[PDB]
């Protein structure tokens with residue numbers, strides 16, 4: 001049975017992805033940073049259906065002198081628990097404003113680290129430790145071509161992640177490792193956001209006036225790691241219900 | 249059971265797609281132009297497997313005074329044979345050089361008709377004649393961004409098809425019809441091409457140094473039509489083994 | 497002195513380009529279809545500043561059996577008047593809705609003809625009839641990525657023109673003919689449109705809440721035809737005040 | 745007289761850009777890190793032509809605890825020597841391999857700092873310290889869509905810069921600051937590269953089989969800072985001689 005690492009897999013989209021891949025035979029590594037309780041409950045729920053089919057792994061993905069080693073360990077964790085690592089899902093991601101006009105480098109460290117630099121180090125480590133079906137799926141953002149005002153640093157990071165998806169896809173093709181991305185448009189809203197506001201956002205979606213559910217995002221991810229996407233590498237699969245096509 | 253129309257579905261990619269959707273319970277209308285034999289052998293094979301599950305339809309898709317009605321009849325052929333039409337696959341495509349420097353308007357009529365205008369009329373007829381899962385999949389070309397020298401017209405047509413995919417996607421969103429596309433890189437080579445030449449082409453693909461099989465392309469189309477892509481509309485799915493990433 | 501052909505140069509943007517190039521020393525061929533009077537007033541004004549520096553030319557660019565020859569004559573017009581043709585500016589364009597749901601092929605003929613096919617035949621003739629600084633500038637649309645609901649055919653046509661800009665750029669490079677494009681976002685509004693509606697459009701522009709003047713667009717074209725863009729080919733220059741960057 | 749800041753302006757492209765803006769009346773800050781001799785000679789050359797029209801500023805743009813402060817001083821320099829800053833050219837850039845398969849974070853610090861994070865901190869400072877004509881121009885890379893194997897981190901950083909170009913453009917529009925980019929394809933080759941190798945690279949450029957000269961790149965930047973681009977913001981101007989258009 002193939003093993004999969006899911007960053008930020010304790011809740012929301014990452015959680016849904018960890019469950020989908022597990023439902024498909026995958027022995028899923030549930031990485032987290034602050035959501036220990038949720039990660040613990042997930043690993044228990046999964047291992048309940050299948051003994052030793054899940055383990056958790058804690059690690060801060062923000063930029064720092066320890067990041068590199070942490071990423072090596074996150075990957076090494078999959079090998080200790082399952083003796084292999086077939087899939088890596090870079091889902092973990094910080095998201096908040098960094099307005100240009102009125103601490104910053106701490107925001108830079110967290111935004112750039114989780115969205116771009118960690119995935120890089122993780123992909124790198126994942127590759128050097130490697131037939132079967134090896135692949136990486138990066139979680140992008142279909143709306144970054146339309147930069148949300150005040151989110152410059154996050155936007156930059158996601159663009160860097162996009163560049164990493166293509167650079168790694170080409171460089172790793174010879175190693176039989178596919179590298180793709182799933183770019184949601186509007187998906188799980190912030191739980192604290194007022195319903196009125198959530199509704200205003202849902203109505204903007206051309207297809208169904210609704211955000212993508214975590215399961216619909218996981219549908220796309222399951223496909224890219226499946227055999228049905230065996231010739232697919234370097235592609236970013238948009239799942240936005242046509243949101244990016246609408247004009248202001 | 250649902251019904252799907254596959255233009256140019258008598259052989260190669262279009263054949264693999266008709267077979268695939270049929271294997272998933274679809275009733276198929278196999279359109280063709282000159283591949284009368286294959287069209288017949290396929291429609292019979294499918295009917296052998298399932299009585300009254302496949303019909304055929306002959307037609308030219310080049311620009312002309314009779315194109316509009318031809319497309320209406322192709323779609324109408326699905327409603328007559330099965331009383332319904334849920335999926336439309338725009339696979340039919342003319343492909344050949346049109347060098348700017350040493351008949352042109354005839355080439356423009358055939359290249360643009362098959363690759364863009366016909367798909368336009370087809371989607372139009374399809375949408376006007378329409379819960380279920382209605383979707384359209386256009387067959388694009390991942391390499392049209394790197395214009396093959398001498399294929400100016402073909403390239404313009406495919407580009408028009410991409411605009412069609414997104415324009416229709418948004419416009420038909422309220423009608424619950426999803427419009428997406430699959431963009432192969434190097435797939436089935438011309439049967440007349442010498443092996444030496446075919447091998448020079450295959451070797452350029454980063455992932456495995458091989459062209460995409462028809463089944464691998466059929467895989468992406470099947471995914472975009474499946475329920476696993478219910479939130480996807482207006483997206484082009486590249487299936488090129490990283491080909492578009494390599495520099496000359 | 498170099499000669500330039502400006503399609504649809506009788507009024508608005510095309511008129512401003514014509515004048516701008518003339519002011520830079522170009523001998524111009526003001527082409528029109530129905531605005532003979534505006535064309536004549538322009539050609540008259542230009543020749544008053546420099547004798548024999550401007551001639552007008554009439555022709556319909558819609559698809560028809562006469563299109564190929566008409567485009568040939570438009571280019572042949574530059575050579576008859578000035579004995580040369582150094583610059584081609586594809587600005588003439590048909591623009592109106594073509595909703596998918598409640599004559600079409602005549603709309604296709606006009607929208608595809610003026611926006612895509614005529615430019616292809618004109619570039620073809622221009623290239624075949626050829627150191628200096630030879631270049632072509634296609635007038636695109638920055639918002640065609642966010643398809644305006646109900647303008648499917650127009651959008652497809654402009655995409656085709658984009659595909660042409662690049663295919664021609666690469667294929668004509670060995671002939672030292674550069675092919676580029678300018679893509680306005682919101683420029684000259686319809687003269688009939690109510691000031692209320694015009695103002696609602698203006699306020700959407702992030703940079704100044706104003707549409708682009710004909711001159712500003714002229715500035716971009718002038719730059720692309722100049723020596724200052726001698727290494728530029730196959731590029732599309734966006735001029736939208738950041739309009740394409742805003743979210744709905 | 746407006747004042748401009750040019751990072752990495754001591755040699756090659758940055759040197760040519762500084763000279764070009766200076767010729768247009770611009771008071772140009774020449775930033776450098778290691779090329780003290782060169783920077784000193786350029787400023788002397790410039791002042792010699794116009795007393796007090798040039799000054800230099802030293803600063804490492806790699807990621808570090810000092811970067812934020814350093815970038816602030818770079819912008820501050822323009823205000824100290826000219827009491828104003830109208831133009832920022834983010835030209836400084838590290839470029840070298842970081843292969844995925846056989847110190848890394850130190851490479852990430854140098855590659856991401858110079859190409860993406862410093863520009864971010866510089867634009868941030870620049871905007872906070874501000875009619876006239878304010879604009880930023882980022883030096884991008886037209887080929888980063890075709891990731892050069894082995895240059896992953898450099899590629900990711902340039903992608904982040906492209907993201908910055910668009911996010912900043914939209915966010916600073918209300919403040920009247922235009923943010924654009926110039927993307928060279930093949931320009932000045934490494935001085936130590938053998939001619940044979942240099943020739944191989946040159947022959948790949950479709951337009952003239954030659955790399956772009958620093959002056960041709962400088963031309964594009966001079967246009968984007970000029971009044972002739974007053975409506976232009978958020979656009980990346982490719983200057984590649986058609987290179988990005990050729991298939992492998």
Ligand SMILES: NC(=O)c1ccc[n+]([C@@H]2O[C@H](COP(=O)([O-])OP(=O)(O)OC[C@H]3O[C@@H](n4cnc5c(N)ncnc54)[C@H](OP(=O)(O)O)[C@@H]3O)[C@@H](O)[C@H]2O)c1
Pocket residue numbers: 007008010011012013014031032033034035036059060061062090091092093094095110113114139140141142183184185186187188189
């Ligand atoms: N939700 C949407 O609408 C939407 C739309 C487009 C794209 N996306 C993208 O889709 C993916 C999933 O979105 P989501 O909404 O589920 O994400 P999210 O809820 O924002 O969660 C990201 C998770 O990753 C972890 N994380 C964040 N910063 C980290 C850091 N510095 N170090 C280590 N872990 C860190 C956190 O885990 P802990 O809780 O364990 O700290 C956090 O729960 C993301 O990459 C996102 O950008 C989401």
Ligand SMILES: NC(=O)c1ccc[n+]([C@@H]2O[C@H](COP(=O)([O-])OP(=O)(O)OC[C@H]3O[C@@H](n4cnc5c(N)ncnc54)[C@H](OP(=O)(O)O)[C@@H]3O)[C@@H](O)[C@H]2O)c1
Pocket residue numbers: 255256257258259260261262279280281282283284307308309310338339340341342343358361362387388389390431432433434435436437
């Ligand atoms: N093969 C590749 O490597 C590759 C790469 C990128 C994209 N694609 C795209 O993928 C799709 C399938 O590729 P393919 O290689 O299978 O295509 P293909 O073999 O060229 O088949 C095109 C089919 O469409 C029909 N057709 C051609 N011209 C027509 C016209 N004027 N009017 C009506 N029907 C016409 C033909 O039917 P009859 O045989 O019945 O005459 C033919 O079977 C195409 O849209 C193509 O552009 C293919």
Ligand SMILES: NC(=O)c1ccc[n+]([C@@H]2O[C@H](COP(=O)([O-])OP(=O)(O)OC[C@H]3O[C@@H](n4cnc5c(N)ncnc54)[C@H](OP(=O)(O)O)[C@@H]3O)[C@@H](O)[C@H]2O)c1
Pocket residue numbers: 503504505506507508509510527528529530531532555556557558586587588589590591606609610635636637638679680681682683684685
């Ligand atoms: N205005 C904007 O906001 C905007 C925004 C984005 C892009 N654009 C693009 O910028 C360019 C110039 O815009 P514009 O507003 O000045 O255009 P426009 O006013 O619509 O003018 C198009 C001109 O082309 C000619 N024309 C139209 N249909 C024709 C046909 N079938 N055959 C031959 N000639 C035909 C007309 O000439 P006669 O008057 O002689 O009949 C007309 O003057 C166009 O290519 C447009 O797509 C404009």
Ligand SMILES: NC(=O)c1ccc[n+]([C@@H]2O[C@H](COP(=O)([O-])OP(=O)(O)OC[C@H]3O[C@@H](n4cnc5c(N)ncnc54)[C@H](OP(=O)(O)O)[C@@H]3O)[C@@H](O)[C@H]2O)c1
Pocket residue numbers: 751752754755756757758775776777778779780803804805806834835836837838839854855857858883884885886927928929930931932933
């Ligand atoms: N040359 C090409 O073919 C080409 C092609 C595409 C894009 N470009 C882009 O065009 C721009 C100019 O290219 P170029 O070839 O002239 O550049 P380059 O010679 O590579 O020089 C970059 C300059 O920036 C400075 N620099 C590098 N790393 C730095 C760091 N960590 N901190 C502070 N300064 C640093 C250096 O200044 P000191 O010497 O003072 O240390 C160096 O001279 C770049 O942004 C480049 O990416 C160039």
